[PDB]
Amino acid sequence: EVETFAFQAEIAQLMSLIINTFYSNKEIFLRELISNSSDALDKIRYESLTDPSKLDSGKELHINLIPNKQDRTLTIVDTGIGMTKADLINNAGTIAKSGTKAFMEALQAGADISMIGQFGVGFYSAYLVAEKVTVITKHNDDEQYAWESSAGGSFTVRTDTGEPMGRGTKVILHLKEDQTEYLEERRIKEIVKKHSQFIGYPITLFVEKER
Amino acid sequence: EVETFAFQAEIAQLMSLIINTFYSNKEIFLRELISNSSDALDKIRYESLTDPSKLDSGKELHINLIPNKQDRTLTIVDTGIGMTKADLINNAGTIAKSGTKAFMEALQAGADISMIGQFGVGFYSAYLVAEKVTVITKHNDDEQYAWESSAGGSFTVRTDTGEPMGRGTKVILHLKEDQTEYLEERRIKEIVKKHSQFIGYPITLFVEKER
Ligand SMILES: CN(Cc1ccco1)C(=O)c1cc(-c2n[nH]c(=O)n2-c2ccccc2F)c(O)cc1O
Ligand SMILES: CN(Cc1ccco1)C(=O)c1cc(-c2n[nH]c(=O)n2-c2ccccc2F)c(O)cc1O
């Protein structure tokens, strides 16, 4: 049912550095997740040009930002190419390791945590604001899967029986107690305008009804 | 033998804007070409993880910068995944068109030409410094091809009978008469240090012997 995997030492060290170090400019996590979403959307759109059947699982190519004050979650949903089980399990591999080492070496040399995206490990900036990250994904060539990590040196992968998404990836950030500003409409709007103004797909910021 | 194609109106308009407008910060072309090279290198390295036979065409993953004062050419060579004939012919398609329109709209709104890479059309910044660009490419699944454009609204594609490269892409910039600074060792070293310091592959700047 649930498979548990250990992160390689370098990635676990990176996650520990991110989830703990004193760094106030945490807003940069959103640009990194939106950029990965945009890259996945480019991937499926390219495939759709020579094969219109690749969009049978959903024609719309977009990014949705869904805050939930009750659950204390910020969800980033995209209708990109998605990830197979193998993509989830092999996501933290050889290239992620080289990028982590280079990033760590850059930080020792005076670089800033906001430069994380230049090393291909931008996703891990999610741990600046989240105590746990759940990733639900669906690729045309595989079943729906849930990946999850609380940065304790391991991650889990299981088949997902939740609401079927047609195709794409949903990143659920279970926010840290002191990071609820990232659930506010004004705050999210400010960050998207500042760092993700030129993303080539519609970014819809959902609003919440009164509880 | 040689096939000639017209660029869509939007891309031809972009190339004309780049090859003509007054913009002094031309050095940004190198970061764009190196970034595309790094992306192609990531692509072949990922494939090599589950299939070591993908590297039969060459194990080394690197970027070489080769100035030639005699020919007035700056060549950017990479051993990335390369491009098939279809990749060369379809390179200026639907996504390139949307990115061009968004870029043009951003420029009208006060954006700078250095932001070109955010729209997925960074390659075209080559025309800030080059009067003509020749691209030799080899993908594992196809033969060696030469793509070429002098930004006159068309490009050519032909099979390439030159020195066989194992795999990857070679971008030959035929520099404009007043852009020979990009053939100088000190100048190229400065640009690579300023804009491409964190690229995850070795960048070798070749030096020239005395003529
Ligand atoms: C969810 N994660 C982190 C993680 C934990 C487990 C596996 O990945 C991400 O980085 C991430 C991945 C994709 C994705 N879907 N399809 C695909 O090619 N990508 C992809 C895109 C850009 C770099 C890498 C990618 F895979 C996405 O749409 C959003 C994301 O936030
Ligand atoms: C040579 N051109 C311009 C053009 C004219 C005709 C076709 O392309 C480039 O952009 C370009 C492309 C690659 C490449 N090889 N394989 C692959 O996937 N890419 C690729 C990488 C990043 C975005 C797009 C890409 F295709 C490269 O290694 C270097 C390059 O400078």
Author numbering:
A (entry chain A), B (entry chain A): 16 to 226
What do the study authors state?
Here we report the investigation of the role of protein flexibility in the modulation of binding kinetics and equilibrium thermodynamics of drug binding to heat shock protein 90 (HSP90). HSP90 is one of the most abundant proteins in the cytoplasm of eukaryotic cells, comprising 2–5% of cytosolic protein under non-stressed conditions. It is a ubiquitous molecular chaperone intimately involved in a variety of pathways, including cell signaling, proliferation and survival, and protein folding. The N-terminal domain of HSP90 (N-HSP90) contains the nucleotide-binding site, which has been the target site for drugs interfering with ATP binding and ATPase activity. The unbound N-HSP90 has a highly flexible lid segment comprising residues 107–14137.
We determined crystal structures of the N-HSP90-L107A mutant in the apo-state and in complexes with representative loop- (1, 6) and helix-binding compounds. The complexes of the mutant with helix-binding compounds revealed no significant differences when compared to the WT in terms of ligand-binding mode. Besides, the shape of the binding pocket is changed in the helical conformation, causing a partial closure of the transient hydrophobic pocket and consequently, a more compact and rigid conformation. ITC experiments for compounds 1–20 reveal different effects of the L107A mutation on the thermodynamics of loop- and helix-binders. On the other hand, the thermodynamic profile of compound 16 binding to the L107A mutant is very different from that to WT. It binds to WT N-HSP90 in an endothermic reaction with a favorable entropic contribution and an enthalpic penalty, whereas the binding to N-HSP90-L107A is exothermic with a favorable enthalpy and a reduction of the favorable entropic contributions. This behavior was observed for all other helix-binders, with the exception of compound 9, which suggests that the switch between the endo- and exothermic profile is largely driven by the conformational rearrangement of the protein due to the L107A mutation. Accordingly, the computed entropy of the complex in the helical conformation decreases, while that for the loop conformation increases, leading to a change in the thermodynamic profile of loop- and helix-binders upon mutation.
